[PDB]
């Protein structure tokens, strides 16, 4: 099956930022034809730790910017929703509606996304056990969702630290396609946080174990990003990472267990 | 004064709310030292299963809660799940409760603060004690003056919550702290036998109040049936924690 | 039942240190007649993180120093063993043989302690669940132990941090007398560690929940201690702490659940 | 060269050791690129239950292991539990293994190092990756030149271990790293279905070798019966990790 790569800047800092990242993602989509690329960016960071942190430029501006990326590069789109009313307007441009980690249990939000007819990708809550995502998928199917993804992004391990229990990949694969969030899994919640040095090794682990796609927030200059500055992957490094995981996936694939 | 927030997990009917409210009223008269706040949810918006009980709706719930406040003169608290609900709920709720999974949702917190009511945030199972400082800051920015942080356990491996009591003195630096005695012993995705021992610990350590979901017949509850405290055991636990608090309070750190 | 208070300097830094702490413990034993005091100190710190840290002055010197405390003040004694051969010599002076946390599963060590006829106190391993101490008690009884204690000293919570799950107290009480380690429970393993500011609040929690005794490492000047300098309680504060827990125990006692 | 440490958890008999050793020898001939080390314990000194199988003693175990090395020319490794055992075990053991619970016992580590043999320390379930630096330092101080650190999972809530793969690159800073594929999936006080997926992850991340307890009939094993890999599946897993390593090694960080 075509490998999925969801990538883009964490937040829609500006329409210019999106087009710049979109251009590179488009270039990579032309090279890696065996990969299905989906451009990602949030119109709002609704769960920042501090009230003083950057949130965004609003839904309207965000949807408009994402539409430009889709029209200019012909790339599929994904963004996250935070409250039920946002599903409808967002569904106008988003091919995949993303459900934030902390909201993976909010029934109305999941139902709102499912009835749009769009694909739905749920970030697995840091408090959730792998086997408990079965009911999350059940809610989505109940709501009309036909294309469902579950994204592994770490589990609470002590304070301000997340661990990736790779046993979750084959467990969740029992009821949905699985995506591995390479940048969210190395963040240190309320750290100041994150450790970029572990992004690559863990993504290699993900593809060796076996998943249906990877999720990576990428920015031209992570050091200057307005959100997740400690975990976003430098755009210049995206190509090499993708080539590497495709190579590891190929050699490991014959050993992937059947569900 | 010491705060005691109690009531059935969900508003299964205003009939249930009236039976529990009657008991809460009686204790309210017996323990004048304590401030009682009646609690119940008009919607269980985060059930694991799509087939579980959610409730009878916001309107039916506000009506029922309104009846309790009018029939017993008790303060009220209920939780909201999306920003638009803050305004209508603030009509009856003296304290607006923010669910644990939603403790980081800026708009929900701001919407609760805008109502001018007191706000009680359930500390997420994913949050470290010191990270609640920012939660308080958001509420203050939104105009909230009476802010509470409720300890309800922290993720400890899978399907288990542990109570790190170091959180009580840490959170007290920026807000009044409440201890959720029934939620802290639940096993996500609980053990009633640990409710009393841990609530005794909470008052020995020092808190500003306790939170307890209570039902006449927990086993018959439509939500949190495994952790809700039988209504008949409430008086005994309250008298017990008041006695322990009386003695231990001498040592609560400044 | 008489409340147990096990206290003393973490390590036998010198015979002079022991006698100084012993004098104060003796004074407190005369005041708090309802308490059973047991003087504690290790002749060897066999599990230090660094090879350069203080270990001790040997078993011989240690036993001799402890014997002096017992002869001079008439106080019961306890110290820990690290290998089976140490049980016999140590049993000559120790009323209670302590089993280190990391060694709570070492069958031969537990058996060696049990056959001495002395009481045995096992520090619960940071990796052990409360219900798994049932087999630890079974091993000790199998080995001849008639007086057994289980000591709560925290559980691994993420890296370099320990949490105290107070549910362990009533669980372990099902098969043995329970002791709460007030100083070990606030240490940050490999922290540099520990947080002395939490010693008092947590010990209050312990007695409110209900335990059979408390364990506290105390030193005249913790800041200058050769081991556990970040968690040992200043000797001057011991009296107040004991009075406080006795008061809280009394008021909470009528509510202690029956096993 | 890449290291593969494998053998039955316990020396249930030298008869068992010979059957497994025969298979390990065959793979040794098939995979010349890999260095095989036969492993088995002469004593399970940390069983949860006093009524569980421990073994036939040190002497019987050393004898059995001695037979494997002589009959197959395979290197040997076994674990010690108390300092006095280092010397007698060093007679046959090329690598002395230190149990996870005992990774902080200074005298045991020093005794292992004094023998002049290589030392492999199982990382305690209570240890953070960076704290193994001090473990290595103790061994170096004791005269050890060939030092290995084995990842075998970390305490995650109760009766569960999680493998934090960030540990591999962190520990590689001061020692050769081995991944225990069978111990990492056990549930203290396991799931065989996760052995292969996680070992694939280990080689994709990058390690210096793998550790696997294997038995002809795991279900009939006297120890770790729930995690031991069936002997017949060993060749397939080895070929698989060698292929993955061949491709992924290009990306192992310096």
Residue of chain C with shortest Cα separation from B195: C167
Instruction: Compute the distance between CA of residue D211 and CA of residue D217 in angstroms, rounded to an integer.
Output: 18
Angle between helices C107-114 and C134-142 (to 10 degrees): 50
Query: Are D114 and D144 within 8 A, CB to CB?
Result: no
CATH class of B1-254: alpha beta
Instruction: Compute the distance between CA of residue D156 and CA of residue A163 in angstroms, rounded to an integer.
Output: 10
| C-alpha closest to that of C110 among C132, C139, C151, C78 | C139
CB contact under 8 A, A201 and D163: no
Query: Are A39 and A7 within 8 A, CB to CB?
Result: yes
Query: Are C118 and C78 within 8 A, CB to CB?
Result: no
Residue of chain C with shortest Cα separation from B250: C244
D105 contacts in C (CB within 8 Å)? Answer: 46-47, 82, 102-103
Half-sphere exposure of D133 (CA within 13 A, CB side): 7
B82 contacts in A (CB within 8 Å)? Answer: 83-84, 108
A173 contacts in D (CB within 8 Å)? Answer: none
What are the helix (H) ranges across chain C? 15-31, 59-73, 87-91, 107-114, 134-142, 168-172, 199-209, 238-253
| C-alpha closest to that of D211 among D1, D2, D4 | D4
Instruction: Compute the distance between CA of residue C98 and CA of residue A15 in angstroms, rounded to an integer.
Output: 66
Give the DSSP H/E element, type plus range, for residue C11.
none
* Residue from the list D162, D202, D203 with its beta carbon closest to the beta carbon of A165: D162
Half-sphere exposure of B197 (CA within 13 A, CB side): 23
| Rg for chain D, CA atoms, rounded | 17
Instruction: Compute the distance between CA of residue D88 and CA of residue D62 in angstroms, rounded to an integer.
Output: 8
Query: Are A241 and A216 within 8 A, CB to CB?
Result: yes
Tokens of D43: 């004593």
Instruction: Compute the distance between CA of residue A15 and CA of residue A23 in angstroms, rounded to an integer.
Output: 12
Angle between helices C199-209 and C238-253 (to 10 degrees): 30
CB contact under 8 A, D104 and C49: yes
Residue of chain D with shortest Cα separation from A247: D247
Tokens of D243: 């292929």
Is D190 in a helix, a strand, or coil? coil
Helix (H) and strand (E) counts in chain D = 8, 11
Chain A contact present for D207, CB below 8 A:
no
Give the DSSP H/E element, type plus range, for residue A216.
strand A213-219
> What does this entry list as its resolution, in Å?
1.8
Residue of chain C with shortest Cα separation from B167: C198
Chain D contact present for A159, CB below 8 A:
no
* Residue from the list B48, B126, B141 with its beta carbon closest to the beta carbon of A132: B48
Inter-chain CB pairs, B–D, below 8 Å: 11
Question: Residue D35: exposed, middle, or buried by beta-carbon count in 10 A (0-12, 13-18, 19+)?
Answer: middle
Task: Please spell the DSSP secondary structure of B30-96, one letter per residue.
Answer: H-TTSEEEEE-BS--TT-SSTTS---S-HHHHHHHHHHHHHHH--EEEEE-SSGGGHHHHTTT-SEE
Inter-chain CB pairs, A–C, below 8 Å: 11
CATH class of A1-259: alpha beta
| C-alpha closest to that of D116 among D139, D133, D84 | D139
CB contact under 8 A, A159 and C159: no
Instruction: Give C24-31 contacts, CB < 8 A, sequence gap 24+.
Output: C24/C235, C24/C238, C25/C73, C25/C75, C25/C238, C26/C73, C26/C74, C26/C75, C28/C238, C28/C239, C28/C242, C29/C75, C31/C239
B46: left (phi > 0), else alpha (psi -120 to 50), else beta?
alpha
CA-to-CA dists, residue A67 to A11, A84, C144, angstroms: 15, 21, 77
Question: Residue B66: exposed, middle, or buried by beta-carbon count in 10 A (0-12, 13-18, 19+)?
Answer: middle
């Amino acid at each position: 099956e075509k490998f999925l790569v969801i990538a883009g800047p964490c937040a829609i800092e500006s329409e210019e930022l999106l087009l710049k990242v979109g251009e590179e993602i488009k270039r990579l989509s032309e090279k890696f034809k065996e990969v299905e690329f989906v451009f990602k960016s949030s119109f709002d960071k609704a769960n920042r730790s501090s009230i003083h942190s950057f949130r965004g430029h609003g839904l309207e501006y965000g949807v408009k910017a994402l539409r430009k990326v889709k029209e200019e590069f012909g790339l599929k789109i994904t963004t996250d929703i935070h409250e039920s009313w946002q599903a409808e307007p967002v569904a106008e441009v988003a091919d995949i509606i993303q459900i934030p980690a902390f909201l993976c249990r909010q029934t109305d939000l999941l139902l709102a996304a499912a009835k749009t007819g769009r694909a739905v990708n749920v970030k697995k809550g840091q408090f959730l056990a792998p086997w408990d995502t079965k009911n999350v998928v059940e809610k989505l199917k109940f709501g009309g969702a036909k294309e469902i993804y579950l994204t592994e992004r770490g589990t609470t391990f002590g304070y301000n630290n997340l661990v990736v229990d790779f046993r979750s990949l084959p467990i969740m694969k029992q009821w949905a396609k699985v995506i591995y969030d390479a940048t969210g899994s190395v963040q240190l919640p309320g750290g100041l946080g994150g450790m970029r040095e572990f992004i690559f090794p863990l993504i290699r682990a993900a593809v060796a174990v076996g998943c249906d796609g990877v999720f990576m927030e990428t920015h031209p200059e992570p050091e200057k990003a307005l959100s997740d500055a400690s975990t976003q992957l430098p755009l210049s490094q995206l190509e090499g990472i993708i080539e590497a995981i495709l190579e590891i996936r190929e050699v490991a694939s014959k050993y992937y267990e059947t569900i």
